[PDB]
Amino acid sequence: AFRARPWELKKTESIDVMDAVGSNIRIDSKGVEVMRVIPRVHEDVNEEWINDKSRFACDGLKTQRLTTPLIRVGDKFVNATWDDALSTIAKAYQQKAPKGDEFKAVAGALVEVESMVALKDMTNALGSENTTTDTPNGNSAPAHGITFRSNYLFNSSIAGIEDADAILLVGTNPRREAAVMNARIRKAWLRQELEIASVGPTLDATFDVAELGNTHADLEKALSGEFGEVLKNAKNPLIIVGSGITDREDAGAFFNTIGKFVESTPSVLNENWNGYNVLQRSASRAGAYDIGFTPSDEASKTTPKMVWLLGADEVAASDIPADAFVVYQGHNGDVGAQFADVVLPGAAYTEKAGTYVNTEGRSQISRAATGPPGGAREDWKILRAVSEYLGVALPYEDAYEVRDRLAEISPSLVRYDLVEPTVFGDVAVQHSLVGPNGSVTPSSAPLTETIENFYMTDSISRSSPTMAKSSIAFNKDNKKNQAFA
Amino acid sequence: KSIISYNGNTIEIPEEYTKQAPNRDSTWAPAQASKTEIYKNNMVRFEQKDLSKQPMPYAGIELIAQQPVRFVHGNTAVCDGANHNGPGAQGHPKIFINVDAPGSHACQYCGTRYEKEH
Amino acid sequence: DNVPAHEIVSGAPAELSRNRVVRIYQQAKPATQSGEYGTFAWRLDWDIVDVANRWENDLIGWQSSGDYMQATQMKFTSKESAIKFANKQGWDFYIQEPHHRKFRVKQYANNFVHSYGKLKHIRTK
Amino acid sequence: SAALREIRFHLCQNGSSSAPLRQFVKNQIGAFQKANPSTKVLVREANGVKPIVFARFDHGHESKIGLDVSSEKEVAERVKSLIEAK
Amino acid sequence: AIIATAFAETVKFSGSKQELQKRTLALYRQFLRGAPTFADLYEVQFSIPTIRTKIRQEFERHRFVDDLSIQNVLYAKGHMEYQECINFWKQQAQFLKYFPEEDDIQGRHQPSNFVDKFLKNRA
Amino acid sequence: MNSFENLAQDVNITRSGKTLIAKGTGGRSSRTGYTATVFGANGFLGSYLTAKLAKHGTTVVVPYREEMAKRHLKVTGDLGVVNFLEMDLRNLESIDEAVRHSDIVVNLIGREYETKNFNYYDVHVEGARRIAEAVKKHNIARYIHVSAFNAEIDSPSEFNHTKGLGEQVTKDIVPWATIVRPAPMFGREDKWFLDRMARSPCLVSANKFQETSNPVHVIDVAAALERICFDDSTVAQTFELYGPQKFTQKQIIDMVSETLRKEVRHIELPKALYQAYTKATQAIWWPTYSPDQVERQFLSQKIDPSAKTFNDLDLTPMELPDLMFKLIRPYRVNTFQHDVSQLENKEKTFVHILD
Ligand SMILES: NC(=O)C1=CN([C@@H]2O[C@H](COP(=O)(O)OP(=O)(O)OC[C@H]3O[C@@H](n4cnc5c(N)ncnc54)[C@H](OP(=O)(O)O)[C@@H]3O)[C@@H](O)[C@H]2O)C=CC1
């Protein structure tokens, strides 16, 4: 309200975590403090808008932060040094002797790609392949496969919805996953001929949707009945799949049916148009899948002995055993810290020049607005140093070497702002979605909304009191939020 | 008051000097540092010094709640904190407050309140 | 190659040349305003070094610093001049290509067009 | 070098050097994934890059050779050599 | 006319490397001959050989510079410093700016590997 | 940029349960988090110590008695770093005030002579006990006593007797106390070593100039105290900061005379006469040699080999014969130039007398 005046502010052009869209922004700092966030222009991503979470979660970067390392000695935490905690981690490794795939690595939302690379190279250097997301079914590899980028990305770019004619929504509420693209759908629905369908929970949308089921049974029904014909006879159709489908046990049964329909219907897949799309809801998953970071089935069944969880606060206390040694990296203490035996501060998006990849596959580079607070450090430096403390090392020391590594992993991670087409669409849907998913049987469990509250989704947001006031109000049960029409 | 230092020791300070001001104990803004956190962080420079003689001005948030509400006939009240005694402006810019709503309404510059006669 | 190294005669340190990054860019069009004069100039600003950007003083609450380039912002007329000046001084740079508003037609008439079917939305003004 | 564990293909989308590898990927990927059922096979494209393969056996030991050849078969044998020369 | 001071050389930009070679060598020779004066005039706490070592280091700094104009600039700047030093214009501080090494070891931990820099947040 | 050359890390944690996050690069504006207390910073060694502590932002509490000797310490750091208190060992609250908020304490107290208000016992034993009891009450994490070389509980010298009693009392109340035992320190504006050999009209030795010792530069002892204040490995330990080279008094005096190019004056008159002349000079108000110090002229340095040394701190202590030039060049008279011959012919060319 009154905290600052514009002439005092250091404007920095950075990237918006809190959604997989990668909305460009302009941060405004006052020294060490970040006063506000405001949008930036990019017509192929966000086009002058940003959601409310991204504009009002800044208040979570100055409270319930991690400023020092911590150790657990019992029920309490005890402040400690960096030397002491890293040596404690090493003694835990040597005492416990994890072998092979007992060393688990978990990367959550709000992570760079440099960190997950360094965590991946280190994990493997200890002989482990159990790299894993903080998703419910992150323990096992995705149904859609990481092999081709085309299988897990919003292929038809976000500028492609303007050219859309027919749309299908499978297990996704775009108003809660990437609101900006819901706004774009509405902008297209008003000024064009557009007919939409949904297979999921009934979603209070900003547009007419023509809901038609909540099950795999209704999905095959519509895709083979009427709206199948609407998608065939469309010129630029889209089939939008939510990532909550990837977070189900029967994800293969879906992605198989959608892949069979995609390859069967040319209009969705041609040499000019790919109408298959996966909408992720966090900024890390696409960069993870681009650098691997999927569990191998061999590690998927091992019960881990050490658990290095990175930015992870969505864990359930069942994914992590009791007798395991646990090491949280984050910048905010909300869930994953409470489990941890050791807690190592990291830095938030405003304090690290990280690379983040969005749904289209567009790589964007962040900028540092401020230095990380207190005894906090950049993540990849922490993992190099603990790596050295362990019986291994990483072969890089500064930024330029980490960037050359990223290129060695995937060269589109250093083509900043460039979205690329892809030549392996047919092959990608033949190899990943259709083949290894015939053996899954579909459940009758009706689809559930992925996000029960658009506010209070990740650690930055749960630590923000503003999201608390905004989740108490803006609830449907309140009179103020419903008009009697 | 006895304030625990960070280094495990204690910091004794009398009650008259822990109040945020001689008319109010609590802080009137979230970012305001309470006198206890001040002392606890800065006793090295307060040690041999006399706290009676340090500046302890009164708070305005409590002296303006005491000021009686003013009333008007109409949906507007005009405020200009003008002295009326000496020449010049000597006050704050003219501000027309809406007072149709049931409660009192205060000028944004000065906190003087106005109401619609009821 | 044959771009002169004025970094040797600049009298400045070498840490700027060996460890420090700059960024070249145009200021984005603010959303809080509609003006565009602050743009059209290619600024050059150094990237932060974390430990020495700012830190709060104990005494009175002021913000300190050790980074001596936290307020310097050179202004240039074009990208090529910026890049030449940087290379001549040996600084390592990242270029930030701008993002321009995409042209689309706008008519006052589209507000008042016929809907042969159900009204999508009811307009106010 | 106890096992192969990851394979990464890099290539252009439309340049000249990468076409034989484009054919190898379009035609042989399922057979490669069945003959190596325990490995992450990763294809990642980017315009202007020089086609190349990376393999990761164990403990992060990575190997590499370019694939600027003129045939799909040179690709097969060259890949297989890099997979064998652990 | 405003006449030049003692050891002033007129600025003259040579067109060839072969002449500037000679001029630089004369400058080096003058620095060496004058080093004992640099030890007497400035109350110095070390050797004349150490001064000559630092001079050799400062001339090895720009030994591999092939652009002629930059060499002319460097030579002019060096003659400026010789004029500043031999005439007693500089005081002790501005001279011992060139001899940080001789002063006592600044503390214990001087990081040289990664991990220490990380523990001190300098990486 | 500047560096925290004294610290190995930025997040340190004391043994009292305080977390101390460093801020900055390590210059005037930086802060180390720490808060210390130095009971003799007004003196010869403590001055160099506060300079090294406050160069990096360590808060320094400096008890003083004379307001005017101290002012040369405020220069050593930024505002709020150096903090002053008026104190006296005969007032206890003053000592609790000085040590309350401290993570580190440093006792440099001790005169080389007696007075009317303080005998050797009261200042080297009781003062140590008072400070120790306050260091214990407030449970200060660290305590760093400095007790003179050659200290021994019963000895011909009352100074070394008290210095030994101050050792055992400190270590018998504050078990985690660190004790340093420097040998005769030398440097610029030293008390009784080089300024004396360079200024005193005549020296005297009740022995011959034969008392053997290992001297040491004071800056290095200050470096040692810096490298002990922050290293928590040095609790319940003892140090012998003596120096590489053994030097008899006569050897030092001959090097002093060589470097000065002037003939230092030494007399070597016997013990009882010098002891009497010292005793009678203790009634004038200014410090002079005292009867107990000519007693120490017969007591060479016995080094304790069970205690830590410079090499346990990664230090390379300096040598007297190198540094004597820097320390005695000011008193160098430098009479004139050598061998003016082979200059008449050169002088003959210049105009010596204008008209
Ligand atoms: N310098 C040396 O060659 C050697 C020194 N030491 C020991 O190391 C320490 C160094 O002191 P030094 O460097 O010699 O310079 P000083 O001995 O002059 O340091 C003396 C300090 O002690 C303070 N002090 C002395 N007596 C009292 C008292 N009665 N009450 C309060 N404060 C007092 C003085 O305060 P003020 O100045 O305000 O009067 C002064 O700050 C001493 O403990 C000494 O015994 C041991 C061996 C050799």
Ligand SMILES: [Zn+2]
């Ligand atoms: Zn008013």
